[PDB]
Enzyme design. Structure first.
Site, PDB file in Angstrom:
ATOM      1  N   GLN A  28       0.849  -1.105   0.019  1.00 41.15           N
ATOM      2  CA  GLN A  28      -0.199  -0.103  -0.061  1.00 41.15           C
ATOM      3  C   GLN A  28       0.905   1.217  -0.089  1.00 41.15           C
ATOM      4  O   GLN A  28       2.072   1.233   0.409  1.00 41.15           O
ATOM      5  CB  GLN A  28      -0.899   0.124   1.160  1.00 41.15           C
ATOM      6  CG  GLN A  28      -0.459  -0.189   2.524  1.00 41.15           C
ATOM      7  CD  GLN A  28      -1.653  -0.381   3.605  1.00 41.15           C
ATOM      8  OE1 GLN A  28      -2.532   0.205   3.465  1.00 41.15           O
ATOM      9  NE2 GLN A  28      -1.405  -1.189   4.582  1.00 41.15           N
ATOM     10  N   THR A  30       1.149   5.731  -1.616  1.00 41.38           N
ATOM     11  CA  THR A  30       0.093   7.070  -2.469  1.00 41.38           C
ATOM     12  C   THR A  30      -0.594   6.279  -3.494  1.00 41.38           C
ATOM     13  O   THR A  30      -1.501   7.041  -3.751  1.00 41.38           O
ATOM     14  CB  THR A  30       1.209   7.824  -2.704  1.00 41.38           C
ATOM     15  OG1 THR A  30       1.906   7.360  -3.873  1.00 41.38           O
ATOM     16  CG2 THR A  30       1.932   8.552  -1.548  1.00 41.38           C
ATOM     17  N   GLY A  32      -2.568   3.736  -3.681  1.00 42.49           N
ATOM     18  CA  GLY A  32      -3.491   3.127  -3.338  1.00 42.49           C
ATOM     19  C   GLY A  32      -3.302   1.631  -2.520  1.00 42.49           C
ATOM     20  O   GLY A  32      -2.085   1.659  -1.899  1.00 42.49           O
ATOM     21  N   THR A  33      -3.839   0.623  -2.984  1.00 40.21           N
ATOM     22  CA  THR A  33      -3.496  -0.458  -2.440  1.00 40.21           C
ATOM     23  C   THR A  33      -3.596  -1.704  -3.350  1.00 40.21           C
ATOM     24  O   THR A  33      -4.365  -1.586  -4.345  1.00 40.21           O
ATOM     25  CB  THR A  33      -4.564  -0.902  -1.228  1.00 40.21           C
ATOM     26  OG1 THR A  33      -5.928  -1.151  -1.662  1.00 40.21           O
ATOM     27  CG2 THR A  33      -4.864   0.215  -0.226  1.00 40.21           C
ATOM     28  N   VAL A  34      -2.739  -2.729  -3.167  1.00 44.35           N
ATOM     29  CA  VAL A  34      -2.706  -3.694  -4.004  1.00 44.35           C
ATOM     30  C   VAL A  34      -3.175  -5.157  -3.135  1.00 44.35           C
ATOM     31  O   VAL A  34      -2.128  -5.310  -2.060  1.00 44.35           O
ATOM     32  CB  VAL A  34      -1.298  -3.910  -4.909  1.00 44.35           C
ATOM     33  CG1 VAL A  34      -1.330  -5.569  -5.416  1.00 44.35           C
ATOM     34  CG2 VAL A  34      -1.396  -2.819  -5.777  1.00 44.35           C
ATOM     35  N   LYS A  49      -5.979  -3.960  -7.413  1.00 48.03           N
ATOM     36  CA  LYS A  49      -5.371  -2.716  -7.199  1.00 48.03           C
ATOM     37  C   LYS A  49      -6.720  -1.700  -6.933  1.00 48.03           C
ATOM     38  O   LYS A  49      -7.056  -1.291  -7.995  1.00 48.03           O
ATOM     39  CB  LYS A  49      -4.590  -2.106  -8.074  1.00 48.03           C
ATOM     40  CG  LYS A  49      -3.704  -0.641  -7.756  1.00 48.03           C
ATOM     41  CD  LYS A  49      -3.139  -0.257  -9.034  1.00 48.03           C
ATOM     42  CE  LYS A  49      -2.420   1.270  -8.715  1.00 48.03           C
ATOM     43  NZ  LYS A  49      -1.780   1.547 -10.206  1.00 48.03           N
ATOM     44  N   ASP A 151       6.118   7.078 -17.035  1.00 47.16           N
ATOM     45  CA  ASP A 151       6.600   6.900 -15.557  1.00 47.16           C
ATOM     46  C   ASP A 151       7.285   5.612 -15.171  1.00 47.16           C
ATOM     47  O   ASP A 151       6.789   4.956 -14.173  1.00 47.16           O
ATOM     48  CB  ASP A 151       5.337   7.113 -14.588  1.00 47.16           C
ATOM     49  CG  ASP A 151       5.593   7.527 -13.233  1.00 47.16           C
ATOM     50  OD1 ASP A 151       6.893   7.978 -12.949  1.00 47.16           O
ATOM     51  OD2 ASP A 151       4.725   7.341 -12.221  1.00 47.16           O
TER      52      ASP A 151
HETATM   53  O1  LIG Z   1       4.980  -0.421  -5.783  1.00 48.11           O
HETATM   54  C1  LIG Z   1       4.496  -1.380  -6.344  1.00 48.11           C
HETATM   55  C2  LIG Z   1       3.653  -1.238  -7.536  1.00 48.11           C
HETATM   56  C3  LIG Z   1       2.399  -0.743  -7.189  1.00 48.11           C
HETATM   57  N1  LIG Z   1       1.351  -0.406  -8.322  1.00 48.11           N
HETATM   58  C4  LIG Z   1       0.934  -1.547  -9.133  1.00 48.11           C
HETATM   59  C5  LIG Z   1       1.141  -2.745  -8.892  1.00 48.11           C
HETATM   60  C6  LIG Z   1       0.434  -3.576  -9.592  1.00 48.11           C
HETATM   61  C7  LIG Z   1       0.844  -4.815  -9.434  1.00 48.11           C
HETATM   62  C8  LIG Z   1       0.253  -6.084 -10.559  1.00 48.11           C
HETATM   63  C9  LIG Z   1       0.524  -7.143 -10.224  1.00 48.11           C
HETATM   64  N2  LIG Z   1       1.357  -7.876  -9.093  1.00 48.11           N
HETATM   65  C10 LIG Z   1       1.762  -6.706  -8.194  1.00 48.11           C
HETATM   66  N3  LIG Z   1       2.043  -7.143  -7.133  1.00 48.11           N
HETATM   67  C11 LIG Z   1       2.749  -6.448  -5.922  1.00 48.11           C
HETATM   68  C12 LIG Z   1       3.614  -7.134  -5.091  1.00 48.11           C
HETATM   69  C13 LIG Z   1       3.935  -6.495  -3.878  1.00 48.11           C
HETATM   70  C14 LIG Z   1       3.679  -5.105  -3.741  1.00 48.11           C
HETATM   71  C15 LIG Z   1       2.691  -4.671  -4.341  1.00 48.11           C
HETATM   72 CL1  LIG Z   1       2.340  -2.829  -4.020  1.00 48.11          CL
HETATM   73  C16 LIG Z   1       2.291  -5.226  -5.583  1.00 48.11           C
HETATM   74  N4  LIG Z   1       1.287  -5.403  -8.310  1.00 48.11           N
HETATM   75  C17 LIG Z   1      -0.194  -3.045 -10.946  1.00 48.11           C
HETATM   76  C18 LIG Z   1      -0.590  -1.713 -10.858  1.00 48.11           C
HETATM   77  N5  LIG Z   1       0.181  -0.751 -10.130  1.00 48.11           N
END
Ligand SMILES: OCCCNc1cc(-c2ccnc(Nc3cccc(Cl)c3)n2)ccn1
Length: 345
Positions: A28, A30, A32-34, A49, A151
């Site tokens: 999680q 800025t 949002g959350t995953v 997400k 980005d």
């Molecule tokens: O900073 C991490 C990416 C956050 N944004 C994001 C993440 C995703 C995304 C898609 C598929 N698997 C994951 N795994 C995963 C694993 C550890 C931490 C976090 Cl937070 C996620 N994240 C998609 C769009 N945007």
């Protein structure tokens, strides 16, 4: 583990939510959350997400994810679902949720795990990761796709260290650019921002994503961001401090006199057997002028990548390289040059 039906913003969203179970929070921040979840029908691991949309900017996460879901590229996340939820802290907020396949880690954390042990990541991992990251932007930049991510950073490059796989994600800032149309220049995370963006050009090209990828290659080999400026002006200063000050004609095209630092001095890695090749590639990505940067499909043919074609080449855990490395989509093959096809297909 089922998602709470009462949090659905509408009937379509309740139906999509019923497709997935939530397992646990993955991360999680800025953005949002995953959450890690599972598609009930397939058992497949998904990343759910909750998207926080900054209204000062145009968010195109959903629309670009839907455009890319036609392609099923092996190095881009694939949209499975989207739905709207009511806020937990305030139920008048409504949030977009996007669901894609789950990737266990970010490139940032995978690399930081090595450097927190006083060692660079294994050269073969840096190489297969870079190959796949260049492949992801090659696909984005095809004339049939024409998506500029804008980005790319180690936090939105996802990796599975055990199998050597990589996926690009996070398209809220992405946009289809046109030489005839204007765009916001304050885009990208500062350390990854191309010289043309630092100068405030409202017209730019997909070559901005090549610059970001070069920045990430350097970061994998250094352990920290290569160009760490305190602001727009500081960012340009850090770039010139490392690369050398460009000619006056270069700076006028984009709008101190540093000698720059040799890559051998930046990375201090005398064990890297093909450093000369690695550093040739890095220099070809980090050209000041956007039109001079090496284009993805050509970069994929760079001699740095030669050992990825050998069946005897293994990942650090003795596993085979990913099977999809040289599996290209027809939309990619059909625009390759004869030489690129000979090398890659
Ligand atoms: O900073 C991490 C990416 C956050 N944004 C994001 C993440 C995703 C995304 C898609 C598929 N698997 C994951 N795994 C995963 C694993 C550890 C931490 C976090 Cl937070 C996620 N994240 C998609 C769009 N945007």
């Amino acid at each position: 583990m089922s998602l709470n039906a009462a949090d659905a913003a509408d009937e379509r969203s309740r139906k999509e939510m019923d497709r997935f179970q939530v397992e646990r929070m993955a991360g999680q921040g800025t953005f949002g959350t995953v959450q890690l979840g599972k598609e009930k029908s397939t058992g497949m691991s998904v990343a759910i997400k909750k998207v926080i949309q900054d209204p000062r900017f145009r968010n195109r996460e959903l629309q670009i994810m839907q455009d890319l879901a036609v392609l099923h590229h092996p190095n881009i996340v694939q949209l499975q679902s989207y739905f709207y939820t009511l806020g937990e802290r305030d139920r008048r907020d409504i949030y977009l949720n996007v669901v894609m396949e789950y990737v266990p880690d970010t490139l940032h954390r995978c690399c930081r795990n090595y450097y927190r042990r006083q060692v660079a990541p294994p050269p073969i991992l840096i190489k297969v990761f870079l190959f796949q990251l260049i492949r992801s932007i090659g696909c984005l930049h095809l004339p049939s796709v024409n998506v500029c991510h804008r980005d790319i950073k180690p936090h939105n490059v996802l990796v599975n260290e055990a199998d050597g796989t990589l996926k690009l994600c996070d398209f809220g800032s992405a946009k289809k650019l046109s030489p005839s149309e204007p765009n916001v220049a304050y885009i990208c995370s500062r350390y990854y921002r191309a010289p043309e963006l630092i100068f405030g050009n409202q017209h730019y090209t997909t070559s901005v994503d090549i610059w970001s990828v070069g920045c990430i290659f350097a970061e994998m080999m250094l352990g920290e961001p290569i160009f760490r400026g305190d602001n727009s002006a500081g960012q340009l200063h850090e770039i010139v401090r490392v690369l050398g000050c460009p000619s006056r004609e270069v700076l006028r095209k984009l709008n101190y006199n540093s000698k720059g630092i040799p890559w051998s001095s930046v990375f201090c890695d005398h064990s890297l057997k093909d450093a000369k090749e690695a550093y040739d590639l890095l220099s070809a990505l980090l050209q000041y002028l956007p039109e001079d940067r090496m284009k993805p499909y050509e970069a994929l043919c760079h001699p740095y990548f030669d050992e990825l074609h050998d069946s005897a080449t293994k990942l650090p855990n003795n596993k085979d390289l990913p099977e999809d490395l040289f599996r290209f989509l027809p939309s990619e093959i059909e625009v390759m040059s004869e030489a690129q096809k000979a090398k890659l297909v």
